[model samples]
Target: RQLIRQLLERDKTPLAILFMAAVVGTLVGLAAVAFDKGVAWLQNQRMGALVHTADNYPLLLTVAFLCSAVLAMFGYFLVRKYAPEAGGSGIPEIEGALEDQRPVRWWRVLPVKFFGGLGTLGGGMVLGREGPTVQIGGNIGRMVLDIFRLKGDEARHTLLATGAAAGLAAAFNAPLAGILFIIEEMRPQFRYTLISIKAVFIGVIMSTIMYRIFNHEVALIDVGKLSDAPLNTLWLYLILGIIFGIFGPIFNKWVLGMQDLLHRVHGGNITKWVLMGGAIGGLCGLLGFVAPATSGGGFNLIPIATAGNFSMGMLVFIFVARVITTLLCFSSGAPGGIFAPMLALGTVLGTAFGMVAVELFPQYHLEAGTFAIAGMGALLAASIRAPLTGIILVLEMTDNYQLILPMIITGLGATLLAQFTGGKPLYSAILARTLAKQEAEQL
Candidate 1:
């Protein structure tokens, strides 16, 4: 008893704290599956109904527009009225929480995001689920700490990090990527410690376990083992990186610009915010029914988009179209993420370039899918400025190890070019802007 009790006492991490970390993953891992089907079903069914009715054209386009219009408007109102912090991707909000500037209001956040996201995303808004998923995990981490009567600054921050990593696992089922996401993307704000990282390991482990249990353990992207790139053809990836590198800063500027644009239009009025914002959602529903390629979060669009689906010019069209849709969808401030859409946008343009490379260098025997793989991380690195997180996240999602070299080259090319062109990290820009608002209000 003496020796065992001494061992327990000697440890800096509390047993409840660690076990609570497990429960955070456990609760959120379970929080993973059951919620998606219905929300996705609402999204799916909303589309399924329109597929059959397209024969009516202008008559039914109204149906598509208004249905989701009200749906998105409803979700937007919920966020404004109940929890303003629940707006957008929640990544900045998570970062703010890590720095202790923004406190977690789980009681308001969890339900509001659940239902608000249902309306926002279910209405076919082009938002990624992963941000909300990670944010939810972060919320649960903080919320649970409060429940456990945790007030220690050290333990509280550690568990919050744990919850965030675990939540990423829940969505992507990529434990390593989830861990790296917290460590790499949220690197500045999150405190690193022996205890904290180990707790992250536990949280992601349990979350991944629960993820595998409920859903099958397929890689999120489900792309097959694409052919490897030989040396001469590798230059094509760099060229494509240049394309995204140039595109990157312009894109982030547009995102921040659009937020400013939309906020001007809304002017903090709830009705103006809800109606006009919802109108964008309605516009997305119309766009999805017509093109389907440019609508929704980019995940479902990836595998099919990569399979020689769009013609070369069509890829450009989809890229441009999705970029506009992505901007409108995200900038309007519905309850979703921008990451998946950015990846999808990158894939379309990346594959388009790869197809051109294949045609140009028939002697080179270039693999188109390799370009597709490289593009996923390249654009993310360029725009988001989290090369490690984007690269490794893409690595696990595709289950293709041989292609890491291309991803590395593509990432370096993208990042260097992006920096040369004056691009900054998208999340940092976002978080900094939000912080400015808080400061302005306090003043």
Candidate 2:
């Protein structure tokens, strides 16, 4: 306890932390911009080839799948063979490290996650860049610590968190969301202090500034700001929240179950693992060519779905299909993330609900996009148990500042109900499992 006390004590590091935050913000911003551009270039290259060979759909699909498969296989191999700890979302790993519950092997994770993730995600999987970027940013923070030999726990804790905030800020150009993510999702591991909070703020500001420099301050997803959810209509959002609360745990269980099944089937053999990756990647590629809606991260699908392009049944079908692909890819231990895929899932379901509600009550004339926006954060809230972060992230990405209250209500409902229904935060569960594996190894 005394040791912990010393570690928590403020080192009067206001200036130092602030400066580091600035550095982190700048570096993370550059990293995010570079990563975005790099992935875009790769995607274009792959797509360009397919377009040129448009007549040969089968060949194009095969090549696309092979490209993604090979890239994702390389990423999985790098992490599994070189640094097992770098798998999954990586938020829990950062939290575990802050609490001294886990070690940070930055040297291996940094390069592998960055390059490998670029490949897998670029290959058109149902993944998000934020997860890998945040993880890499946290590892970069640790790398900074080791390089400077910052021995005390305080320095380590503050800097790692600062990097995480910076990374998120850079990724979405959402400063407030970045800070809120640490505050909400990372509540268990983060030790709140005035100095630490300021560090986070500084980091976010820096990261946002750098991100803006790379890409203008335009919102990531411009759905055209929507109106607030009126008090009378609040119940509708709650209903949506409850639905997500039920589905969130089911989704997490499926993910874990698929992971276990994959482990048993392959027994950690690289060839089998790679072959499975190729199969999944090929399927995604073919889907991209055919349906287009069912493949790739859902960033592109949001507007179309919300615009009522598909019927309720069609939306549900896409939702189910994406969920299956998400489980297959993520559970296979591909070096990608489920963030975007989950958001996509939430959007599809939310849009379906909105469409149904609109039909049921034409008087309200509620836009399905509003629900889509609200639902974007709702599932994140339920699944991760981080309502604040989910709310802020949605606000940042969509700039639907007016929906804050409804967002909160929906997010809280989702979180509390999910908790009541025995759902655990997805990242935390993954981290606990990782620690259990470590303990067994030691034994």
Candidate 3:
């Protein structure tokens, strides 16, 4: 109380912003941890009981279908009934809010995203937690601002960005990548001020500390140490990047197309929308039984994919299968992220490419895992046009410091090709669509 009184009496704008940054970071970190645990618990509950009924095939299948369908339907219903903005990745909405193009209905969004995301992700959808965490983080920032009754634009904007960065850091345990994501990916929306950057850093540090306290220190993805790519092998990574570059634009188009298709099919009917979501969720549940690799967020599949567990043909097969599933689940407006799914796709494709390279160039003695690591960020770089964040995120997740040059080369190559091929940045495109919708509604 005394400290609060003293700080309030001081009337220090910077200090106030910094203090809010800490608060936002702590809130976001706790949210991230809680979300993760919530999803795990829900998933376990859904699957654990069925594990013993494996001998009863029909009963197991029925249980799995009903469990996932109900969970996913609940998520869709929440979004449709309460906050449509909570649907999908939610990043675009935050981006729009940051630019003042959209309102921050934090009260509606916080509960909708948190509980809705738990339902969808827990139901075994192909989604990432990072998106929900980022959205939640930004909302928390806005909530804090409203509580403090702070009216300064700079303070609001800085704390919003700070909370977002902290959320990313808490989600992946990658503080540097979180900071870089704001400076790189959110560059257009974020005002790069000295105070803002420091706030971001402080938020990330606080969030990371909180995350460590709960989750312990561990790399999100543990692909064992990989060998360095030689100069001769570096060119191969560029070619690999080029492949992702070509795929990136095509993937983006597929996503947009699927989104349109889903919307058209639903035709704004809440019942139709939720039923479709339930069907997709049920299909994912069925897939989990047949080919578990093709379902879920793809986080668990990354290390397995990169560890040379599958043949080249099998790797390509899973890659293609997941591409379809990823597009379907994400485009259908599930409350999850495409980030982890893209990383998994990149790893699968890169590993396959590396296997082929090893066969063709036996003398180079290249490691496929290095290619997997390099390729992990390639698709994100190409699709999102945020090479630095993708590179740093992959590096932080994989801990392959030796492959930085190759990663950079691959990222640049992918971005260049994606640009040349007329690929729009994914988040920016989403935000533009959202803004267009708002304008149309206003008209």
Candidate 4:
């Protein structure tokens, strides 16, 4: 009765926005699920038959290359023809939209991102679903607002942020992390009003519930319970963070350079742009066969890498190999995210550092997995400049609450050094490039 009275006495405008947030969450959750299943189905269709031709090496390689090439070309074509904003990680575009700097063409974006993501990700390229899902979720928010004839800038902004949070929640099943991501990473663009924060929370809850309906209550990454990092060995994590801090800026530079290279190669020609995408996709398909560990989103490789399944040499080899593949796949402007690949890179390098630490100080009795957990968040912290979100997201995904202190220590060290070394946040840099492009085209 008290709740009812409070609601009745309060303004109804906020209540309406909250209700529409639920609608946006539900729709985005469904879209995330469909995109996940769609990618799996497409991959199966492309690779299922090739399992029998393993003995025929030449035939297998040719078939795999051509199949992935066709699929990737299709995605590139969609983005080039219909919605270029849907290309690459769509998160930047969403951020642009939140600030009213970019237009939200939901009518074009929804289909292009959904179908184009299916092709690029389905081609077995090193990309992630979270980017597309986040973009899609934001677009759905605009769609809902338009359909219901919602007016007011506050309402529009609140719903946009709500949908983005919901999409991220659905992607990783980390509702709190999703909320924090907006509060921390997108802080510049997201207007944090009391009513808006509540709407974000509500949207996240709704999307998480919908995700659970499909995926059930399971941690996305299950690395088992490992020994915790003692305070004595915490400094090692800081050192590891410093390593990633140096690497983070270099990685960002490489990504931007590769993007420029691709732009130069294509020169805005649709046919050439698509053909280049196909060649890169075909090469990734070949890598999938040659070095199976280095291909795809790298989600499945995380557990194996963190468990110390590979030797130090093999870990380093895979790490370098993936750095190239990740840069190539992402910089080509595919409709996918760099989040998962970045996580995988962190895990590989973290494990390598852990192995060395164990060798140097056997008396400390350190567990490499502890460093793996810390390292997982460290790169994300440095690259995205969202230490809190990275730490919380890794903790939620791994359910390793025991490593919170080390995680925070590593995140802080990484972010501090990254900023000192002149590293800009990846998504923000991407958005700046996008805006520059828009301005240049206007001229």
Candidate 5:
């Protein structure tokens, strides 16, 4: 009752908030474009340098390791030196800021995250840029409000949320999903009024338009429409979801554990940090050249994995390989994200399930790819504790609109089981740790 009263008191005027949301959306869209292009450009530069040695296996391996090491080191150094807040997946930070648990620190975080992200992601770390972009977009919204001296609390909150929606819309070319993500995933912090919904919609639409203007209307993952999961096969998805739910918390624990271990080893020393980062980068580069399937962000591997190109043994191999590399780069505190890599992990596991099912029951005429799509959302749902967002995000990215029911089922299953097992959301856990650390440091 008090919360409701506070919301009503703060936003007496709704239209004004909507208008500002539109403006925030436009700015966020432009920023998202810049972030995407910047990361791509850096990746191209690094790849270009390594291309000449492509045919020479030994030379290429050496170049890959050295270049990736340098790039990864630069990213880590920037985050550690400038903005400690910019490390790891950043969505939780945005959530923390929205709740006033943490500062935005946009001036420091924006540049450090953007450029540092390029270096780490370009180094072939198992990271995604979406996490950084979302956090950055939210910060940009706050920056705008601060710069223009927007005194009203309502205007400030509305626009910040708007920018976050816009960021996701532009990042993955999924407008509706972006809106749903905030509404469903951020329900705790979100002010769910009619005006807020409209603002979110407006933000997403504007971001979509901006994304189309720059990158065109191509779906991020073009896996082609696979056959739907029959009602009989639906049970398999639930089982897969259960598997992911158990693994989700375990994965999060490993990630944090690795972060602590890496920090102790490097002890904030630049030389040691760079050297370790280089080793991880170089190994991934070599993995890229050798296995290729086990490295990079999971975007490229999704299609290949789902298409049934690799055998079950090979799928497990790459899956395990990716786990090691993912922890290595991400736990090193580089300015990249794990969202895409997590998706890749889902694909590998899902494909393996599909293949095994096919061998067991050829009568069902099952396609492994369908499970792949379902898996994408399941892992995300379990790990992030945002099943609806995961479902919608996967639907938008893959254009598998018909798979919504199964996606929702899988996501719900994952979330339910994870919760029942007392597993907390990964980002929330990270944010809480960061805030605790900050408090300790302040003392």
Candidate 6:
């Protein structure tokens, strides 16, 4: 609430901008809720059919592979056929679009991202809805603008950012985090005060309201609360942060590395690109049926990890396997977000750390969920360099405010260590590569 006021007081709230913001928020919220359910339904259907095949191993494997491969192939074909820019998470695309460095083809993106997201994410690939929601939200803003015939730079920018914030708010039910992220990340480029920050507050308000209308008013993650970390034991979270600090930059490097690796394998041939996507989706689907923990976007897997389900060795295996899968699915040109996968990885690792810490010291009481929450944003802060956004987002998603200071330290420590190690922000790196390709084509 104070966060809203902080942004509200920062800028002027003209009547027109405020009005359009409501429109953007409602439309974005509608799209996000539908998209969320769309992805969920597709996955459920795919798994529902798989249940019958459990009697026959060969049939089960074949059905899983065929279903996921076909779905992912459909998503890939759409991207290569109509909208190449919609292939990635589309987060960088918005950052580029904000500065007019990239184009936002609402007509192309709205349909492709919506349907394509269902295909890829539904097929059990390591992807999440967050990026596509934000992308869709921003695109909806432009669509509203064109239809409404609004024509002012202030209106244009404010409406888009408003949709972006509302989009996220609808997802996590966290208006503050939505606007906080939009403000903190976008302040790097967008017009600040002149942009009507109040519209963002309005958009997020309507957006969350829309979300709660359809869905329950609860945090997205909704992990049950646990005891606050002991001060002495809190140092362990910092160590966990440092571990993610090492992992985050390397993972960032691997994301680009996998990008180039796939580029070489596909050689920009749409058919080859799509065939590999089918294969990757099939692989994830195969893993989904065989080893459920290592597949999907990793969001649903978090509670199990934090519940101390996996042994230490098993956690390491899951962590490493997921890293590879995350790189494969994310960097190989998918149409979903990386944030959910990152959070999953953090939870498993954090859970593992707390498990080991408790084992080493039988005297001190420690809960794995606390570390899971703290670790949620460490790598996010480290690689994305958005400490406030990750921390706020983790809080919003988990609804565990007791660990705020723990995550604050962990997030910043990871970011600091990551910066000292010469790591670049992941999305910005992808954006620069995109810019280079765009410039090359222009030349």
Compared with the true structure, the alpha-carbon lDDT of candidate 2 equals: 0.78
Query: Residue 42's C-alpha lDDT in candidate 4?
Result: 85
Candidate 5: where is the Cα deviation over 4 Å?
Answer: 1-16, 269-271
Model 4 misses residue 402 by how many Å? 0.9
Clashing pairs in 4: none
Ranking by lDDT: 4, 3, 6, 1, 5, 2
lDDT of 3 at 31: 89
lDDT of 6: 0.83
Candidate 2: C-alpha RMSD to true structure equals: 4.5
Write candidate 4's Cα lDDT for 118-147 as tens digits. 888987899888789999999999999999
Best by lDDT: 4
lDDT of 5: 0.80
User: Candidate 1: which pairs clash?
Assistant: none
Q: Is candidate 1 or candidate 4 better by lDDT?
A: 4
The runs of at least 3 residues in candidate 4 whose Cα sits more than 4 Å from the true structure, single-residue gaps closed, are: 1-10
How many clashes in each structure?
Answer: 0, 0, 1, 0, 2, 0
Q: Candidate 3 clash total?
A: 1
| Positional deviation of residue 435's Cα in model 2 after best superposition, in angstroms | 0.8
Instruction: Please provide, for model 6 over 283-330, each residue's C-alpha lDDT reduced to its tens digit, 9 standing for 90 to 100.
Output: 988998789989886777776776547788988999899988988888
Query: Candidate 5: which pairs clash?
Result: 65-282, 69-278
TM-score of each predicted structure versus truth: 0.96, 0.94, 0.97, 0.97, 0.93, 0.95
lDDT by residue for model 5 (1-443), tens: 99999887686577566767777788888888888887777767877887866888778778877876787777777877778778778788888877778777778988987778777776666788788888877888887777767677666667778888888888888887798878888888888667777888888898788889999776788776888877787777888888888887888889878878888877877778777776877777667666667887668788777764687788888888888888876777766666788889888888888888788878887887778888888898888898878888888888888777778878878888898887888888888888899899878
Q: Tell me the alpha-carbon RMSD of every candidate.
A: 1.7, 4.5, 2.2, 1.8, 4.5, 4.4
**Looking at candidate 2, what is the lDDT of residue 4?**
69
Error of 5 at 420 (Å): 1.9
Off by over 4 Å in 6: 1-13
User: Residues 75-183, candidate 3, lDDT per residue (tens digit)?
Assistant: 8999898887889686788888787887877888898998888898988888888788998998899999899898998987887788789988998889899999889
- lDDT values for all models: 0.82, 0.78, 0.85, 0.87, 0.80, 0.83
